[PDB]
Design a binder for this molecule. Structure first.
Ligand SMILES: OC[C@H]1NC[C@H](O)[C@@H](O)[C@@H]1O
Ligand SMILES: OC[C@H]1NC[C@H](O)[C@@H](O)[C@@H]1O
Ligand SMILES: [Ca+2]
Ligand SMILES: [Ca+2]
Lengths: 703, 704
């Protein structure tokens, strides 16, 4: 049932350390590799920077002819000699605070204006930022691949060499995330038009969806600036779908070119999204890769986990991310390609004693492998560093291979993992709760994000009151998911797109955080789920619109729901819990025919009901609660207990988090103390223990 | 020397605890007051909520006639019986996680639209957000004061009651700030117009400053939407000056009303600005009080410190805020009207072990008094909680008066303070470094802030590149101030407005973080500072504009500086430090003339020089750095060492923070470990061994 890496036909915990050969004194390459191996790590990970090896146009150095740290061949030979597998990341983009993000200076100087990402006024966005499908950019990328890929091919695992995985580029679309700005290159806008024409066939079909009045596709302009009309919302929605297809076209081009050298190893890509030690935006980045993930079984996405600290302030970020990736990529292990080791930023401390707790929490939260980023600090050679001489701080090893405090923490965690991995990797949590992932609420990197200062999406201007980013961040991520983890209730996430009914029927409850819009397919899926005997929890809105904000009331009509939207005090009562804070004065007030009222406004109007539909049960709440009070945890607890779901343990201290992972034979209880307080507690199944601040205890049980 | 509170002409550390009588069973009021007093607290603090006591329009209960917890009179008499002084805070706003921020439900339903703060389109920003000088709002506020102020007056200290201080309203502008919109109410528009006419006298004069072509004052309106022209920037700048006079007018109206009741006690106000456990926007909000603090010597402002956690992530916020309050209120003690105790919200934990370290760091950082907020948890009666039934968590006492973990932390801190307050309050740190506080860089709450929904200020549109908010947040607050604290160099902050030359000459170094604009008066003061023998460190720009972005080259000409602004790599070399990352491509490029070049671009162009001018020294860096790399701390350290400024102690672990506070008689060494690491280090005065737990402190007293 579990997905995990395999070595020597056994469950293998992938333990990789990022070591940038091009940022380390080559005299000390062997020493770094031996210290990495001595932690019990099995793999080493590195970029192969285009700029570093194509030193001038068509002048390649992979042998240290011009600088000993250009000796990639020797670095590969050292990995083999020190029995480390190798992950290679040849770009073309590598990011990683390398000048020009790893693209050669000589390339950027000589490319035409046409090869750059362009703003809506035809201006160069950044002297760094190419257009991914620029003819010129891809021609030079191919010429780089023509030299680096035969080296990778020779040393790939399917030729019994050390190279087990290769990353394609780095964080495709990251610059559209960081800026909130799309590439308006005429070549991209032409691919957008083909996408639109392909999707709608005729201008009449598009007009009826968008409510536009184009005489042809020639009158259709790429969306830009603020959404003022529903037609603008429609155009931006399809512009977001277009970019997911665009990224799939870019990564497919690179992949086919890589496969042409007989490279048959696993390909990777990695997902950023952590901001100031929380990851509530990372699901938006996962959503940018939806079309790659449906079209490429053979590309494994991993997570760049950057918690910065380990406390109740971010305890919930890593589980939610792991759970959502698992929903989007169920056939591949969940693994952290960028697993924080040290800090990218000197002024943002990474404490060994924090990260050690995060490493063990990551095991409780289902991680199957990771790549310590950065295991080894780096020194940028000769003006190659974007931001300073030094690359990362408080790592396992400094750039000179000095052991730092994190080294002993990684050795301790790695020893536990190696000891347990055969049982641990085959354990799962028993989840009787499923939480829906509705991808369209996440498709807003160009109009609404924590990185966009100026919002282009203001739902009030469209006659709506539930913002999909507020819903997915405060009601879902920081709300329900945070609530369930705090209450020590196991949950799974499911991708609602082309979701199989049978895969929902395993759960005692499905929870859906709904805005006022939801496509017919999902409305239909949830209708069938309940009618066939599923228990559905839905809030804060029964949807009445589809993704284009055209009328779609399938779920409402199938469930016999009638409501009016009315203003009331922010607080409601729900299941006899008084003073439940809700986010909106506007609430759905339900007709209660054939329904049990279970929630009331201050004026005693009915803003939540329970009813039987077919063989199933429906709980709808016409109001938005996250987790900003103890009443919110009481409400989540009452809802879970409607279907008599139980925690795996009774723990005396409610502020101790636990995860029970088991298979037929083995049980692991992970206790996690996210608080600055020594806690003593006892536990028993549904026996006294002390945990230091910001710390952990793992207890094993043979069943 | 030091500002501190006194009682019987002795240094007294003000120790208050916040106890909301309205949120506690009145049968337990005495038990809360006794337990507060047993910690060594001398004072109890509370809101008197308008909504709680005017139960319906013109129906008042201060005696517990309709609800026992409405017996304000009995609470006042218990404070007297239990020998606590009382701070009262009757609003009209209290915030306090109370429904409608403490304003009565019946008021907000009764008020016409023009009582409310309105956006640019004339719509109500928020149903509990009033326009402060609304005739209707002040009418009902006055009727509330008519009933509560006679009780307060009767129970003052001078009439043998316990009431020693009263807060006027609550964090003026906080509600407007949190809404992310500014107030365009027609009262604001009309008062702005009168302000502009008073300021310019003739349309010709305003046109000469703004570069506009108005025919009359009737053509001009309060600026709205985004700044596109320098004339728009000018209009917003005067709009910021106007809002400072407007907040002065609000608190003047409340103050004159209160005085009319024979209330002679000390009046207070409280400063907002912490959010998510940092305070980089607090200086902006304190700047909105500039006209109050110039006009009201007798109103003592205190800080509302909400750290939430205590780590290197926020170590610098409390010190910078204390220093900035001192710069703006130099004749009163620095004190915390709100001194975090527990958490206002369940999902944001407050640990006794964090907060105990914060209390000790606050002593190190020069705090002279505080009010633990909340000392006592409360339960909201009658659905009065904004966010839920329970008011605060992880406090010193639960609502029932049980001691929680924090109680023992507060007892330990207060015992230290009462044992030492006679010396400690008279101690100073030895600051050889002064940092300039240039208030106009902070005047952006209408156009640019972390909370403001619209970005109205893009300096690039005005042909500028140094954004004043980026400068004050990243180069000053999170940059220089953070760097100096991390490096264990003492600094003072001085308000440059009307600043006395005499008060700058005490320092070895004056540091100015400058944008491209600075008024003639400040340009002249820094000129005279250096000519008379001051040592000036100025970056990232020689300013050449005044506050209206018109030409002002006083400083540039007085310092004999020639520069061109050019693009280069972000990276510079400075003082032999390579790969110093700077925030802007554009840098100032200086001539060689009569100067030592000490910083260079990737093209080896001169972007920093040192020179002797008159009796003084000038270091100018034509580039912006905060603290986002190890190179930045190395650069700050190099600049401090230019004038041989030394740390008080050699400490073997650079990540240990210390403060040495001393007077003639006593030395206190504070060690602060802001890191999740047990640290064993040695130290000596410029060797003793110390082990310090994570997120912990040591205090050593020496008799000299
Ligand atoms: O938000 C916490 C606390 N900050 C300070 C405010 O004045 C007070 O009303 C509030 O309860
Ligand atoms: O956290 C934001 C804001 N909340 C309200 C508090 O009273 C204020 O002091 C604080 O700055
Ligand atoms: Ca799982
Ligand atoms: Ca019905």
């Amino acid at each position: 049932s579990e997905k995990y890496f395999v070595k020597n036909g056994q469950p293998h915990f992938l333990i990789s350390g990022e070591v940038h050969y091009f940022r380390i004194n080559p005299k000390l390459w062997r020493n770094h590799l031996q210290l990495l191996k001595q932690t019990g790590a099995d793999t080493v990970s590195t970029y192969i920077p285009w700029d570093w090896h194509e030193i001038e146009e068509d002048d390649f150095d992979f042998e240290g002819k011009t600088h000993p740290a250009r000796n990639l061949i020797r670095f590969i030979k050292l990995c083999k000699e020190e029995n480390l597998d190798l992950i290679v990341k040849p770009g073309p983009y590598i990011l990683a605070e390398y000048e020009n993000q790893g693209l050669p200076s000589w390339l950027l100087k000589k490319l035409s204006k046409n090869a750059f990402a362009l703003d809506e006024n035809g201006n160069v966005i950044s002297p760094d930022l190419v257009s991914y499908l620029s003819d010129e950019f891809l021609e030079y990328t191919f010429k780089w691949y023509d030299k680096v890929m035969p080296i990778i091919s020779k040393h790939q695992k399917e030729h019994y060499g050390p190279i087990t995985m290769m990353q394609l580029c780095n964080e495709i679309g990251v610059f559209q995330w960081l800026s909130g700005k799309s590439d308006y290159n005429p070549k991209v806008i032409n691919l957008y038009k083909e996408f639109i024409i392909q999707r709608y066939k005729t201008i009449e079909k598009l007009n009826s969806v968008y409510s536009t009045n184009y005489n042809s596709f020639d009158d259709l302009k790429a969306p830009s600036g603020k959404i003022k009309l529903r037609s603008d919302y429609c155009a931006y929605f399809d512009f977001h779908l277009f970019f997911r297809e665009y990224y799939n076209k870019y990564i497919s081009i690179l992949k086919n070119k890589i496969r042409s050298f007989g490279i048959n190893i696993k390909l990777t890509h990695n997902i950023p999204g952590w901001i100031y030690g929380n990851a509530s935006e990372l699901p938006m980045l996962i959503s940018t890769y939806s079309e790659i993930m449906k079209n490429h079984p053979d590309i494994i996405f991993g997570l760049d986990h950057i918690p910065e600290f380990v406390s109740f302030r971010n305890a919930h970020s890593d589980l939610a991310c792991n759970k959502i990736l698992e929903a989007m990529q169920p056939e591949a292990p969940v693994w952290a390609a960028g697993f924080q080791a040290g800090t990218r930023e000197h002024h943002v401390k990474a404490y060994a004693k924090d990260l050690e707790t995060f490493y063990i929490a990551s095991l409780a939260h289902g991680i199957k492998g990771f790549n310590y980023y950065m295991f080894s600090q780096g020194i940028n050679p000769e003006g190659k560093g974007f931001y300073g001489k030094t690359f990362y701080f408080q790592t396992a090893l400094d750039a000179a291979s000095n052991k730092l405090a994190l080294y002993d923490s990684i050795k301790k965690v790695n020893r536990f993992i190696r000891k347990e991995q055969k049982d641990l990797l085959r354990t799962n949590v028993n989840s009787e709760i499923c939480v829906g992932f509705y991808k369209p609420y996440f498709f807003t990197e160009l109009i609404s994000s924590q990185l966009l200062k100026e919002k282009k999406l203001n739902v009030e201007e469209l006659g709506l009151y539930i913002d999909p980013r507020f819903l997915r961040e405060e009601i879902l991520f920081n709300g329900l998911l945070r609530g369930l983890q705090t209450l020590n209730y196991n949950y799974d996430v499911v991708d609602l797109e082309n979701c199989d009914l049978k895969s929902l029927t395993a759960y005692k409850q499905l929870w859906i955080t709904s805005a006022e819009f939801m496509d017919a397919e999902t409305q239909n899926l949830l209708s069938e789920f309940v009618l066939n005997g599923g228990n559905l929890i839905l809030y804060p809105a029964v949807p009445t619109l589809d993704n284009y904000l055209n009328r779609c009331e399938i779920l409402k009509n199938n469930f016999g729901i009638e409501f009016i939207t009315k203003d009331s005090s922010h607080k409601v009562s729900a299941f006899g819990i008084e003073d439940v804070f809700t986010a909106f004065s506007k609430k759905q007030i339900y007709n209660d025919t054939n329904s049990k009222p279970i929630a009331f406004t201050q004026e005693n109007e009915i803003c939540g009901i329970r009813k039987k539909i077919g063989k199933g049960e429906l709980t709808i709440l016409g109001f938005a609660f996250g987790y900003t009070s103890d009443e919110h945890l009481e409400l989540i607890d009452k809802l879970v207990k409607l279907n008599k779901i139980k925690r795996e343990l009774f723990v005396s201290d409610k502020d101790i988090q636990f995860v029970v992972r088991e298979n037929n034979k083995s049980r692991y209880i992970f206790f996690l103390n996210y608080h600055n307080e020594r806690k003593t507690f006892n536990y028993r199944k549904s026996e006294e223990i002390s945990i230091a601040p910001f710390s952990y205890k793992v207890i094993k049980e043979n069943k």
